[PDB]
Amino acid sequence: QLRQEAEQLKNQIRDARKACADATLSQITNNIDPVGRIQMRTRRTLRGHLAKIYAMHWGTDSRLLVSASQDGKLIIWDSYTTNKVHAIPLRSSWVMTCAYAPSGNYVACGGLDNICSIYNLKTREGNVRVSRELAGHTGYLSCCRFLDDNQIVTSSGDTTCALWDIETGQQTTTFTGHTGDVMSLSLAPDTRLFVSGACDASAKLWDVREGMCRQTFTGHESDINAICFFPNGNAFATGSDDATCRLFDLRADQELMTYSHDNIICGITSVSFSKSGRLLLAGYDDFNCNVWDALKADRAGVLAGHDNRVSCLGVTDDGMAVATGSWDSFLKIWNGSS
Amino acid sequence: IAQARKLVEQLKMEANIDRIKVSKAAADLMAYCEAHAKEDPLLTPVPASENPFR
Amino acid sequence: XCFXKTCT
Amino acid sequence: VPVLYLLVCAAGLGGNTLVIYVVLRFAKMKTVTNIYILNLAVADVLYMLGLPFLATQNAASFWPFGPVLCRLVMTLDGVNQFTSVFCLTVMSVDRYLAVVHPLSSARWRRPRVAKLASAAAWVLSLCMSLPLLVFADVQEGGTCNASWPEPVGLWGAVFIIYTAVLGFFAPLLVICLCYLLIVVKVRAAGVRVRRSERKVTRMVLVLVLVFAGCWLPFFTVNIVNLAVALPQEPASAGLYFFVVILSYANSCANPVLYGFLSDNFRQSFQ
Amino acid sequence: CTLSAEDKAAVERSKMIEKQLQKDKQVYRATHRLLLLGADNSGKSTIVKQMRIKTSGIFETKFQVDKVNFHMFDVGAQRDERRKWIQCFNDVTAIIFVVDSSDYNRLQEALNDFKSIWNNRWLRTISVILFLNKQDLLAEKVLAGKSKIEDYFPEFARYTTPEDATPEPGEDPRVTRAKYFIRDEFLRISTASGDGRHYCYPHFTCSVDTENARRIFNDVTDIIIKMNLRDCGLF
Amino acid sequence: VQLVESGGGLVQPGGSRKLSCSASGFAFSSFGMHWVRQAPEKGLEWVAYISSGSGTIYYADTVKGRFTISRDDPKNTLFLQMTSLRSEDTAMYYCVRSIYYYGSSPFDFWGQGTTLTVSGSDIVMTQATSSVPVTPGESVSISCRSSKSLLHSNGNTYLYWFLQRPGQSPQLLIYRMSNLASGVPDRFSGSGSGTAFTLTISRLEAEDVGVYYCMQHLEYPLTFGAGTKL
Known about the structure:
The structure holds six protein chains of six kinds.
Chain B: H1 2-14, H2 22-35
Chain E: H1 7-17, H2 20-28, E1 32-37, H3 44-52, E2 58-65, E3 68-75, E4 94-100, H4 108-118, E5 127-133, H5 135-143, H6 179-191, E6 200-201, H7 213-232
Parallel strand pairs in E: 1-3, 1-4, 4-5, 5-6
Antiparallel strand pairs in E: 2-3
Chain F: E1 2-6, E2 9-11, E3 16-24, E4 32-38, E5 44-50, E6 57-59, E7 68-72, E8 77-83, E9 92-98, E10 116-118, E11 123-124, E12 140-146, E13 160-164, E14 171-175, E15 179-180, E16 189-192, E17 196-201, E18 211-215
Parallel strand pairs in F: 2-10
Antiparallel strand pairs in F: 1-3, 3-8, 4-5, 4-9, 5-6, 7-8, 11-12, 12-17, 13-14, 13-18, 14-15, 16-17
GO cellular component, one term (chain D): plasma membrane
Membrane topology (chain D): Multi-pass membrane protein
Subunit structure (chain D): Heterodimer with SSTR2. Heterodimerization with SSTR2 increases cell growth inhibition activity of SSTR2.
């Protein structure tokens, strides 16, 4: 009995979307001038780690950065002079995530053990020491992002997310509804909304104060690994394991474009945007990175080679530098100017 | 029995948002891209003197 | 007679 | 006669070029093992250029050109050949340390060490071949051969013995013990826990047999000649010709064995 | 140069910091790691506790033999699926697998799991060591009646006599010699798909037995030895 | 964080003496040390330095050949030796600490001293004394001059200030000409130029009375000015 009503409601929802397809965005941009070829060069290299590397992050001042390894160590570097500032040991070896605070006073990390911990740096005595630990989860973590000083968000392998308060160290809200493992999440310019995706090949939207979902998408047919936002805040893109990338909108609520080539068989790992939103970058398993045109959907360059798998990417705030990492325990920086 | 009720409630909540046509949406990205083209170092190289990374 | 290589 | 001389060069030339051009593009130098093979190929290919001049000088014709080239060809011909023995010798100790003392030899496996070893090895060959030009010039009167500036009786015997002692014997002694120790070690580990020891024995036996057979005769021939004078007869020249032609097969045997029989090189060859 | 007085202090600080990493690496390169797996029916916990002499998610144990340090790990609370987090163990030494030979009705799942684990894209260059357990119940049930294997696994009736290489380490009736049949059903699968890049080692075990630690050492030594020969290029 | 020293006494010409210091309450291995002395009715003077790793040592001209310094890490103690004393060595001594890295504050702490009895660039400031009412609206300013340009190609300028009160050790207020210390109130402000610098104070209160000083840190030979009353 209830199945028929559900089918009726699904069909009613499907009916509306047909009319909104007023035009195809391919036709309205065929007259735009192309962009052209691009070349870049390497500037600096950083050695030091004894094993493979997983994650990295940038700072607000655009001068400092932090990196992690599965050998149980964290290092902070000075980009201009290539000098090491601090090194901190760990009690656990299996780590996956790290983050940086906006004011530069606090840092957090996590791993297989269901704890995203925090550390302090500024004290009268010279030494780095731990402050607090948060527990309560039943699955391995994926990411824990800062937001403000006294707030933090986290996701876990189990299909639930929660919010925390450092002062009392207890949760305040929980979100549920998924049926598969959750992998990634991203915040918005104005901190009121955020998105996340899971292995169910679907995405959702959430409200922070209220705590209820609003919208969903189902495009892909395979696992989803990466997601990122647009500077305006009304669009986002996703990557999948089936060697495809797609775009979405919030007010129209339908897909726009797809990028693919017949020569590629491997998957994707990371994705990031530029300042003006004209350029898009992504990495692959085959030791190569590619660049794409956001408006014309054509490839325009390559970023040389590496000796092993590539993991992470990042762009600075001022948009003058970009770094890359891989499993070969080495890091590189590119400027690409003439 | 509860699962179906929850699904029905969710579906009812989902179905009352406003909408616009794609033709209107298509122009905002073009305008935004045109507006900020003069301060993109990666799109337009810069003189060697001012490059910190030289 | 010879001394070294290929002398003879 | 000349037909025989053409074939050896024709076969020898391409093999070294194949491997030397393959090494740079795919097998980029990033480990110690990949450095000695670089020097070996260069040494062999540079040595392979010698035969045509001697072909011109006995192939029913006698020395053209003047003294300017006689005392230039011989020095390089002599210097080229001596590098191979040391190049072969070093690898034995390298591999012995690579398998018998893993942890204790971590310091000496750094990439910087190999460069110094190669540079040092490249010098002694020049250091030792000088007497061939300074003490006695290459007087063209003897059809570009060498004739001593002092009484031949004393110095002729001095040259051969002091060359031969260092040329052949010591490396032969060095190699055997190193190649024996690994096979000695293998069995004890194997017993306590089929297919491998047979292969190891086969490989070692083949590389010792080829190495010894490719070079034994010449020094014995020279020593016997020095001991007693030989008569004048057409068979004497034929004996020398056969004794000399054999020496060049080593440079054609070397490139293939070390190069194409390894699994990692084969896999990276694609 | 153009450096000021203050920068040299930072340079010296970095130079001093750089040293400790070499000693850390030297200490690091002298340890081995192992991974353990099994099912509820197996005596994994009993073996661990005997060898020793809330939502943690991971457990650790240590032991020393002949002044050599070994590390072992186990996993705790996780969901059923194993697809995603398996990738992290690409560079471990060896794996151990435990099985209950007494029960007959639940034998096919073990074979299915073995086939599943054997051919994964991320483990082409890792070997496996296998243990069998609980022989006393097998012997006691074989001596008595009221049970048979022909009901479950046909083709045992046409099976030959025990292979010529089967030894006789104990004085027992010939009927007790049914372990070789099971040993050949697992080795049959392991036989194929091999091209010399990984190997398997079977063993027998008893209830609450001992001298289990000595067994792993020889295999570990042999596996370590085999790699260097390929490394040099002489094999 | 406390520091204490011992020594002192009475000697005759042609003697020798030794001094020692002790510390507690922080990681000792990460900090360098310095020495300073003062005269009964004169200014300050710099003596010596030692680095964390014991890799560098420096001395002044006047005492280059006679004085020595040593460090002991396990015992957390410092030592100093003197010999061949003269009549012009009556002074009181002090100790300081320092540390360096991107964004660090070198000088933060000072200690007491012990008494003893025996029987390049120029920096300039004047206006020895001035009158000050106690009304809150009152404001004062001070100036100083140098004889060389302190600016470097990097873009940083090195200048420091200090204040002393009756029967108490000096204190630090501002570093690098534009930065305030952690605990100092926000009333104080400072600015300067290539070769001229100034200080400003607003909303005076009773506790402010004191004496002030300045220092330069470009070339290793360090020099100090003479302070001004208020």
